[PDB]
C-alpha cells in the first residue's frame, strides 16, 4: 500500500556528538532533512557522501566528504559549499568564479639552489561522463583506464612512455617505485577505504610514466588521473614547463577522441575530495637550521607555505591560478634559502 | 530518493497484550505483516479493519472487525476467515458454501400463544457497488439513501409507506419511536464510533415504515438497509410471510433500476460485521417461572437459542437458511411455552 | 533518449584470474549476466553480494559472499545455492529441508572434566523486516537495537541483565571484556569492512549480558543478534540448558511485540554469511600431549571437530540440529579427554 | 486525489422498463457492471455498443447493438453471444464454429421463370485493421475508401468498372439510381443515426459499379463494403457465379496490397450489426395468387424464407454456407412458382 | 535494475580525425554530449542526423547532415545553426528572419538570347505533419504521394497534367526522360543512400508533369515535392510566371484538403538538406569563349553565380527572396552574354 | 489525445509484387500485422529486418533479412523460422536441435593432392551482450573490437599475431591483402549497405593475423568476428586442426574476461545472416577437365558441394557438425580428384 509511512529523515541523522570536522559542524538537522531525498542522476546520495566523515570521527581537521560524480557538487551544493568555503579560507563558490590559467609563459624567474633535492608538480583530472572513484563501477573504471591509455599512447618525443598495469607487475618493483615515489601503494587509509575507493583493487589501476621517469601519471588511484612532473634538483622552471606542456598534450589527445575533463567556472576542475577542488595543484620540494626553531611554523604559515614529513608544499587550490601557485612556492622557498 | 526505508510492518503491529477477542487470538505477526501491504480497490486497509478491535479491548467476546466494502472479505480473507469460522462454531467459508432460501412457502406450523408480546424478524442488506458504512463517503451514503427511497416508493398495497428522514424530524418523536422500537437512536456505542460508522450523523440516515407500522426499514444506521417486520402477538407465521414478500418486492424493485444486493455463495449476504454474515436474520420475540431457575441458561444454550434483556433470539446466521432460523426459534419457544 | 545502450553485463564481470574461493569457481559469465539485472526489494544487488569476495582474493578458503536482506537468498539463489551446498559438504538447499530442534530435553549425558576451561554455545538471529548489517541503514540498525533492548528488558530471574552501549562505555573496560571474551572489538577485518558491516561504528552497537556474566548477547556486530551462553568448567549440560531457555524466552518476548526471527524451512535461520546458515550454532570449549602429534589434525577432521588457536568447535551448521551439534562436540571431546 | 469515488456502474444502468429487445432482455445489472470498465484497444465501450438500442426502444424485434471494431465481439462477448445465439435461432458462437464456402462450383440447378423480375445477391465485408463505421474516424473512413478503390481499379474484363463518389455527383442521378436500386440514400433511419453511422456524410462514401451495371459495391454506407450482384430475370445461376468470381477477385486484389477482410472461425465475417454475422449473404428476388391467402406467411416461415415489401429473401446467415443459402432460396422459390 | 550504467556519450563520439566538412569543424564533444539524449517527437536522433557526414568523409565541402522532420531544426538547433550560418555565408537563423516573396509581378525585364538553350526554375516543398524522406515510413511516403496526386488532379488549363508512377513505367522511358531532364534516377550517390533516402525504391516515388512538359513535379525523390518549371530558349520571364502561378495553385489546392507546407519565419521552407533551406530555389540555364579563360571562375564567383557541368545557377537560398534570386541570375547572365 | 488513430499495419506492408525471395514468399499480411508491434529489447524491429530484402528485389535467391541482436531470432521467429527451414532444406528450428562438435580428434583421413592450391576454413562468431553489425552503435562496435583484441593478445606460440586496424593502414597494402585474401574490402554490396552494416566505416574495423599468415580473423566486417584458417596446398587436416585449436583458444580467452559467444541449442551460433546460422562454417579450396562438361554442375549438386568462381565449398551449415562439413568436402573433392 501507499499509506505505509517512511522513516522520517531525522531517524537517519548521524550521531555526531563526538565528531570534530567541517561535516560535523556544518551538517544540521535541517540540511540533512532537506538533502536526504535528493540524488544525482547516477544514484549518488547524501549518505554516501558523508559516510567517510561518519565512519572516521578524526581528531580536533579533514573534510570527510567525497563526491560520486560531477553532478554531486551541484545536487548537494547546500552541504559542500560551506565546507568548500571554510576549507579554502574565504572562497565562496556561489559568489566568486574560478579562473584557470595553465599558460606557463608568464612565469617570472624561479630556480632553487641545487644544494637545497627534488622538485615535484602534481594535479588531478577527471574524465567527464564517468563516475568518480567512490561511485564508479568496474565498467566505468575500465573505460577511464582505456581512455587514458589510448590518449597517452599518442604522446611523442620526450613525453613518450609506457603504461604499467598494477595487476601485471610484481610487488617488489611496486614497493621500489613507491619508495622512489614512482608508484602509489595499495591505499589502506581508512579515510578512503570507507569512501569505497579501494573496491576491486587492483583492477583497472595502473601507472603511466615516460622513459626519463620525469612525467608520471597515476590512473584510478584517488582520482581518474594524477599527473605528476618530477625532477631531481631545484630546476623548478623546467619541471613546471614539462608539466604544462604535458597537460596540454594530454588534454588535446583526449578531446581528439571526444572526451573532456570535468570543469566548471565556479569550482574549477572537479575532483573527489572537496579540498582538492579548483586547480588540484601541489607544487612541492624535498629539503636544517630552520627545523629546531619554534618560529619556523609561524613563518611557513605567514608565507602560505605548507610543511610536513620529508615536503614543502602549498595550501590553497581555489581562487588563485596554477602559475600563482608555483609563484608562491618559489618565492616562499626563496625567503627560506636565504635564512639557510 | 527510492533508497529511503519504510517502517517495517512489525513496527505497526498493535499492542494486544491486554486484549481478549478473536482479533487478539487470530492476529499473529506473520498475518499482520502479510496483509499490511494489501488494500481493497476503494482503499480499505487492514488497520482500518482492526481499529475497532484495537481501540476497544473489551472483556473476556465481540468480533472487533469491520469491512469497508465487498472486496474486503476477499482481500483480507486470511484474517476474517478464522474469525468467521470460530464465531459461527464450525462454518469454514473456504470449504463449505452458503445456500440462501427465503421461500417461506416451505414452513411448517408456527404460532405462539397470545399470552406469551411482539414478534420481530430482522435482516440487513448492502447495495453492491457502494462502500459499506465504515468506509462510505457522503456521496456514497446519499446514493444508498436515494436508491433505497426510489425503490421503496414503488411498494404498493399493505406494503405502501413513507420515508422519514432523521435530519428533518424532531427528537421527541425520535425517542418515542425508539422506545416503541420504531427508530434507531444516535449510536453512541464506542464499538461502532471507533469504526467510523457515526460520521456525518444524521446526514443521509432515515427510516421507512409502512402505514400499519409493521414493515420497518432502517437506512444507513449500521448497514445500508435493515429490513424489519414487526407485529404484536405471537403470529410468527404472518410476520415471516410479510417479511419474505417485502424482501422479494424490495429486491425486485432495486434490480428494476439496476442495483443488486451484495451476495456470494461462500459467505451469503455481505454485511459490515462478520458476525452478521450469511443471512443476517434475527427472529425475535418479547416474553417468568423459567427466569429464576439456573437451568434456564443451560436449556436455552442447548436449544441454540439466545436470551438477553427484554428478548428471545438465535445464534447462527451462516450455514442454515432463514426458514430454518425461524423453524429453530418457533420450535425452541414451543418447548418453552409448555414449561410455562 | 531510450535508444542509448547500456554497458553489457560482461563489461562489469569481475577479474577473478587470481582469486581462489567459491566465488571464483562458481561465478560464471552466464550466471553473472543472468543475475546482474535482478535486485531485492530493498535494493540489494549481486555486485554488493560479491564485493567482499572480489576485494579480498584470499589464499588457496572463505566464502566471500554476504546477504543484504532475507530476500537475497531467494533472489540470488542461483549464486548462493552452489556455495551453500559446497561449503556445507553436501546439503543441497533446493532439494533437502532443514529441521530446527532447540529442545534440550533430549540430550544424553555430557560433562567435561574440570581439569580440561570454559564451555561456550553461540548462535545468531536476525529480525524479520529489517535489513542485514551489510545493507542496513542507521534507522534500521537503531530499530534492531531498540527491539532487542525492549525484548531483553523483560527477562527475569537468572536471565535478568543490563544493556551496555558501546558508544557510552570506555575503551579500557571494552578491551578488558574483549580479553575476557565479554565484548566484541571494533572489527578491523577487511573481509567484513569491504562488506559494509563497519559503517557508523559504534552507533547502535551494544552488548547485553546477565548479572552472572553467563548469558551474553551481541547486538549489530556481525548479525542483528549473537546469543552466547558461557560458563567456566566443563558443565556443557548447564550451559546448553541456559542457552535453550534463554533463546526461547527471547523469541517469546520479541514475538509479544510483533517481531519474528528470519527463518525458512529450506535454509533455516537467515544470517549474513552463507556459512552461518541453518542453526548458526557453534558449541566450543577452551582446552597438551595431543598438540605436537601430527595425527591430531587427522583425528579432529575425522571427528567432524574444528580446532583453532586457543578453541575446540564444530564444522557444520546445516542439516543437523542444535542438539545433535552439542552431542557431536561432547562425544568428540570425550574421545579426546581419554587420550589426555 | 485518488480517494475520490467513481460513480458505481449501476448508476449508469439504462432504463429499460419500457424497451423490448434482445438487448433489453439480455442486459442484466451483473452483466452491465462486469462489462462497464472493459474497452477495446481503439476505445470502443459498452455504452457505445448499447446506445443504439437504448435510444430506440422499438416495438414488440431489432438487435439495437453495434460493434466499433473487430475486437468488440471478443471484448464484449458476454453481451453479444446471447444475442447472436437467440437472433440466429440456436447457433452458439462459443461452442460451434462457422465454415465459409464461397465456391459456387457445387451448386445444383437453379433457374427462375422469366415471368416470375430481378435476382440479387448481397454480402458485406470489413477491412481488417480499420474501425467499423460506428467508430471510424474521418482518416479511417478515407483509408477504407482508398483501399477499396485501389483494389477495384485492378478488376478486368466484365468486372471492369468505375468508382462514383457521392460528394462529387448530383442528387438527381443519386435518386434515380436509388429508385433503380443502384445507389444507397442518405440513411435517415434513427436505428443507425443514433449508432453514429451517419457522421460526416457524404465524405468518403461512394459507389463502384461495372459498366454492365451488374456488379455493385457500396462503400462506407453500412459496412466498409457491400458487394451486390444484380441482374434482370431469374437466372440466379449467372448472378451467383458472377458474385463468387467478383468476391474472389476483390479479395485477391486487396491481399495483393496487404489488406485482409475481418474473419474468424467462430463468427465468420465480422460486420457492424450482429444480425449480419457469419456470411452476411442475402439472396433476394423481386416477385399474386399467394398474396391474399393467409397461409402464405405460414409457408414462407416453414420454408426458412423471408418476405417483405416489394422482395423474397432469406433468414439465417450463421451456421450455413453461402451456397446453401442460395440453394435454400432457389428451392424455396421453386416450391412457390408451382403454386403460381 | 536501474543501477546499471549507460555508455557515456563520449564513447559514441564519431571519429572525425580524417573528415573535412562543416560537421567535422562544428561537432565538438560538448555539443555531441549535450544533444545525444535529445530526440524529436517522431524519434529522430542526432546520430541519424550526422550519419550521412560520418559515413562519407568527403574531400577538402558538403554539409553531411539531414533532418528527419520539421522539429529537427528546432531540437538540434545547436548543431544545424552554425552550419546554416556558415553554409549560407552570414545568415544567422537565430537573429535574422527570412521573408518569402513568390509574387512574380515585381520582376523587371529578363530575357536571354535564343542563341544562348533551356531555362529552368526549381524549388522543393515538404508537407507539414509527415516525416521527411530520411525518416519517413512507407505509410508516410504513400500519404505524401496521395496528397500530392489528389492536389495536382485539380490543376486546370495549361497546368493540367498526369501523374506517372515510377514502379508502373518502363526503365527505357525512364532513362529517356532522365536524359531529357524530364525524370530523376534512383539515388546512387552515397550521400543519399547513407541518409536513408533510397529505402523501398521505387515505392511511392513518381513524377507529375503537364502535357507540354513545362511544369514538372518530382515526388518523394529528395524532398516530398520538387517543383520544376522548364522551357526551351531564354524566356525566363514566362518560365518564372508559370512557376509562380503553379506554386500558388498547388498551395491553394493542398490547403483546400487541409494540408500545409512546412514553413517558419526563421528558416523559411523546411527541407531535408540544410543547404536547401529558405527558398530552395535554383534558377538555372544551359549554355564557349569564356570557357578556356582562367578569369571566368573569378567573375562567376564575384557575380554570385554558380557554374558546373552542362549549367548556370545561383549560390544562396536564404536571406534573399525568390524574385531577387531570378533577378540575380538574369543580370548575372546578362553580363555574360555581352562577353560572348 | 489518446483517441488519435495509428496507421493500420497493412498501410506499412511492403510492395512485393515484383520481388522473388524467401521474404517475398513468406511475408504474408497476417504475419506482418502480427509482428509489426513487436520489438527486441535493444529496439530492433521487423521493418529493419526486412529492409534489406525490400530495397533489393534480387533476381529469380538471397535471404534478404538480417538480425539486429540475439533476441531477434526469438522475437521474430514467426518470420525467420520458415526461411531458416527452406534455406537449409528441411531443418525446422522449432522441432529439431542443433549439436555443436568442434572436436577435430574424430576426423578420419583427408588430404588433397598438392597438384590440386589453397585450403581454407571459415566461421564467424558474435559476442553475447553486444548488438549485431546491422544494429550496433559506435560504442558497441568499439567494445567488440576491444574484447577481440584483448583476447587475441593472449594467443601464444604459432598462434601469436598482431592486430591491424583498417583506419591506420594504407589502401595499397589493403588491396594487396584483399587480392591475397588477407583482408576484407570496403563492402560496397547493396545487400549489406541497405542493411546498415557499412555505417561509420572504417571505425572499429580491423584484421588480426598470425605471423605465419595462416590464422586470420576479421573484426566487425560482416559479423563480430570471422575466424579464418588458411594454408597453401591440400593439407586440409593441418588447416582444420589449426582452425579448431585456434577457436578453442579464442573462446577460452574470451571467457577468461567474462564474454561468451552467442549460441543456443535450437539455432547454434547466432549470426546476422540467417543463411549463416548453425556452424557458419565454409571449408573452401581453390582448384580442369570437369569444367567444360554439362554434368559437372549436377554431380556437385549430388555431392552437396557448392562451386563458384575461382572455389569449392559446401551448402549446409545447420543440422550437421563442423567435422561432418569438412568430412563432406574432403570426400566430395576426393571423388573429384579421381576424375581429374
UniProtKB/Swiss-Prot annotation, chains A, B, C, D, E, F:
Phosphothreonine modification, residue list: 170, 310
Phosphagen kinase N-terminal domain location: 5-89
Domain of life from the UniProt record: Eukaryota
Gene it is expressed from: CKMT1A
Family: Belongs to the ATP:guanido phosphotransferase family.
GO MF term list: ATP binding; creatine kinase activity
Keyword Flavoprotein: no
Membrane topology, record value: Peripheral membrane protein
Function of the protein: Reversibly catalyzes the transfer of phosphate between ATP and various phosphogens (e.g. creatine phosphate). Creatine kinase isoenzymes play a central role in energy transduction in tissues with large, fluctuating energy demands, such as skeletal muscle, heart, brain and spermatozoa.
Organism of provenance: Homo sapiens
EC assignment: 2.7.3.2
PANTHER family: ARGININE OR CREATINE KINASE, CREATINE KINASE U-TYPE, MITOCHONDRIAL
Protein name: Creatine kinase U-type, mitochondrial
GO BP, one annotated term: phosphocreatine biosynthetic process
Amino acid at each position: 500500500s501507499e499509506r505505509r509511512r517512511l522513516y522520517p529523515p531525522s531517524a537517519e541523522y548521524p550521531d555526531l556528538r563526538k565528531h570534530n570536522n567541517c561535516m560535523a559542524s556544518h551538517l544540521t538537522p535541517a540540511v540533512y532533512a532537506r538533502l536526504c531525498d535528493k540524488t544525482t542522476p547516477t544514484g549518488w546520495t547524501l549518505d554516501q557522501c558523508i559516510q567517510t566523515g561518519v565512519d572516521n570521527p578524526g581528531h580536533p581537521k579533514t573534510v570527510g566528504m567525497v563526491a560520486g560524480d560531477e553532478e554531486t557538487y551541484e545536487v548537494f551544493a547546500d552541504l559542500f559549499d560551506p565546507v568548500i568555503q571554510e576549507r579554502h579560507n574565504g572562497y565562496d563558490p556561489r559568489t566568486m568564479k574560478h579562473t584557470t590559467d595553465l599558460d606557463a609563459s608568464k612565469i617570472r624567474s624561479g630556480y632553487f639552489d641545487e644544494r637545497y633535492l627534488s622538485s615535484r608538480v602534481r594535479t588531478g583530472r577527471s574524465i567527464r561522463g564517468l563516475s568518480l572513484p567512490p561511485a564508479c563501477t568496474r565498467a566505468e573504471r575500465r573505460e577511464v583506464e582505456r581512455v587514458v591509455v589510448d590518449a597517452l599512447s599518442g604522446l611523442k618525443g620526450d613525453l613518450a612512455g609506457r603504461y604499467y598495469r598494477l595487476s601485471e607487475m610484481t610487488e617488489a618493483e611496486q614497493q621500489q617505485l613507491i619508495d622512489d615515489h614512482f608508484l602509489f601503494d595499495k591505499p589502506v587509509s581508512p579515510l578512503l577505504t570507507a569512501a569505497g575507493m579501494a573496491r576491486d583493487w587492483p583492477d583497472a589501476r595502473g601507472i603511466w610514466h615516460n622513459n626519463e621517469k620525469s612525467f608520471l601519471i597515476w590512473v584510478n588511484e584517488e582520482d581518474h588521473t594524477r599527473v605528476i612532473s618530477m625532477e631531481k634538483g631545484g630546476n623548478m622552471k623546467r619541471v613546471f614547463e614539462r608539466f604544462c606542456r604535458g597537460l596540454k598534450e594530454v588534454e588535446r589527445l583526449i578531446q581528439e577522441r571526444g572526451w573532456e575533463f570535468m570543469w566548471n567556472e565556479r569550482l574549477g576542475y572537479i575532483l573527489t575530495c572537496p579540498s582538492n577542488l579548483g586547480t588540484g595543484l601541489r607544487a612541492g620540494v624535498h629539503i636544517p637550521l630552520l627545523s629546531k626553531d619554534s618560529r619556523f611554523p609561524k613563518i611557513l604559515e605567514n608565507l602560505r607555505l605548507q610543511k610536513r614529513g620529508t615536503d614543502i608544499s602549498n595550501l590553497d587550490r581555489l581562487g588563485k591560478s596554477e602559475v600563482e601557485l608555483v609563484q608562491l612556492v618559489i618565492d616562499g622557498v626563496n625567503y627560506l634559502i636565504d635564512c639557510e
